[PDB]
Curated annotation (Swiss-Prot):
Protein name as catalogued: Actin-like protein MamK
Record: residues binding ATP: 6, 17-18, 73, 161-163, 215-219, 286
Keyword line: ATP-binding, Biomineralization, Cytoplasm, Cytoskeleton, GTP-binding, Hydrolase, Magnesium, Magnetosome, Membrane, Metal-binding, Nucleotide-binding
Lineage: Bacteria, Pseudomonadati, Pseudomonadota, Alphaproteobacteria, Rhodospirillales
EC number from the UniProt entry: 3.6.1.-
SMART domains: ACTIN
More info: This bacteria makes up to 20 cubo-octahedral magnetosomes of about 45 nm in diameter which contain membrane-bound crystals of magnetite (Fe(3)O(4)). Expression of just the minimal mamAB gene cluster (amb0961 to amb0978), including this gene, is sufficient to form a minimal magnetosome chain with small magnetite particles.
Length: 331
């Protein structure tokens, strides 16, 4: 059985709502938008030269295409027959981009959004094993926890765009109350920030995309250590404005529900492990990049004890890195 031992390719796939991140046991590492773009008509199909395009270029060309994000920002929920085919196209493309050899047995751990129903995880598993030889579908917080060697007595706070997903890891299948989903996340910050800015600078030409740019450049919580000065437009002209306090307000607005959620999950652990849980509060997702976040949360958790809050080092790739590790380590 030399062939079978040698001709094996492992993949860690972070199959997210907005982005798919992939690492392979041979060192491939790449990122793409979780989107497939289809020609609008037969002429589009001729123009495209292929039946669909996948990833960043699908997004880039979206004005000319019918684009589909198969992990409809939830899961929201039951994935249709049509969207399972869209997911097949996405996963087929990511697996091809990992460049397997023609003799390779492709073995993939595929992380999916936390709230994906059992039925949807089963659907994605069936589809996956039509694309790769062996697959295992796991939830995102598990994959993230696994990569940190944090699978028990841990709480993962995953701050995304549409939701903040908070998961207690207890070394078992999550119970119904081991997860909390908040609707206050990055998009909500954008909205708050847009409006905090316009209150102070009504003349700026502003939308949630501009607010998002300001946020991504300057996000912080706690006492300001620098000035958030951003170069806006007003009546067509460049105008710089200090939006330190709007940024502070908008980013800090996320935190009360997060702290409340951590409390709710903390008390569901056995009492003698609660201090240990507080040493394993992990922030993930795009929102974990907010400046000052770990210290701020640590201070806000003082009523519960002395917390060690950490932010994942690389929100983009740490999930798929963990999935790859699971894939290579599992017998
Ligand atoms: N430095 C930053 N500071 C604050 N927010 C940021 C930063 N970088 C990215 N974000 C935000 O993080 C969010 C994206 O996080 P991400 O974890 O990629 O979302 P997602 O889970 O894929 N999307 P969704 O399922 O719709 O919630 C967006 O709101 C970004 O604007
Ligand atoms: Mg997310």
């Amino acid at each position: 059985g030399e062939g079978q031992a040698k001709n094996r390719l492992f993949l860690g796939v972070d199959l997210g709502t907005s982005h798919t991140a992939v690492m392979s046991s041979r060192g491939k590492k790449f990122l793409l938008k979780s989107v497939v773009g289809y020609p609008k008509d037969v002429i589009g199909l001729k123009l495209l030269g292929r039946p669909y395009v996948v990833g960043d270029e699908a997004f880039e060309m979206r004005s000319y295409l019918d684009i589909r994000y198969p992990l409809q920002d939830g899961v929201l929920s039951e994935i249709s027959d049509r969207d399972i085919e869209v997911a097949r196209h996405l996963l087929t493309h990511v697996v091809k981009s990992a460049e397997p050899g023609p003799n390779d047995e492709i073995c993939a751990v595929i992380g999916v959004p936390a709230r994906a129903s059992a039925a949807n995880k089963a659907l994605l598993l069936k589809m996956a094993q039509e694309v790769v030889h062996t697959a295992l579908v796991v939830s995102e917080p598990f994959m993230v926890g696994y990569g940190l060697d944090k699978l028990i007595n841990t709480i993962i706070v995953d701050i995304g765009a549409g939701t903040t997903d908070i998961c207690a890891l207890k070394g078992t299948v999550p119970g119904p109350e081991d997860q909390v989903t908040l609707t206050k996340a990055g998009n909500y910050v954008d909205e708050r920030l847009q409006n905090a800015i316009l209150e102070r600078h009504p003349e700026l030409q502003m939308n949630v995309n501009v607010a998002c740019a300001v946020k991504e450049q300057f996000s912080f919580v706690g006492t300001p250590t620098e000035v958030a000065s951003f170069e806006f437009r007003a009546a067509g002209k460049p105008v710089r404005a200090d939006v330190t306090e709007p940024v502070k307000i908008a980013c800090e607005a996320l935190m009360p529900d997060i702290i409340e959620s951590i409390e709710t999950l903390l008390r569901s652990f056995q009492p003698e492990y609660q201090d240990t849980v507080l040493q394993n509060i992990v922030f993930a997702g795009g929102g974990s990049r907010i400046r000052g976040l770990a210290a701020y949360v640590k201070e806000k958790l003082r009523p519960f004890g002395d917390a060690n809050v950490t932010c994942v080092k690389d929100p983009t790739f740490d999930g798929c890195r963990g999935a790859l590790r699971l894939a290579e380590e599992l017998p």
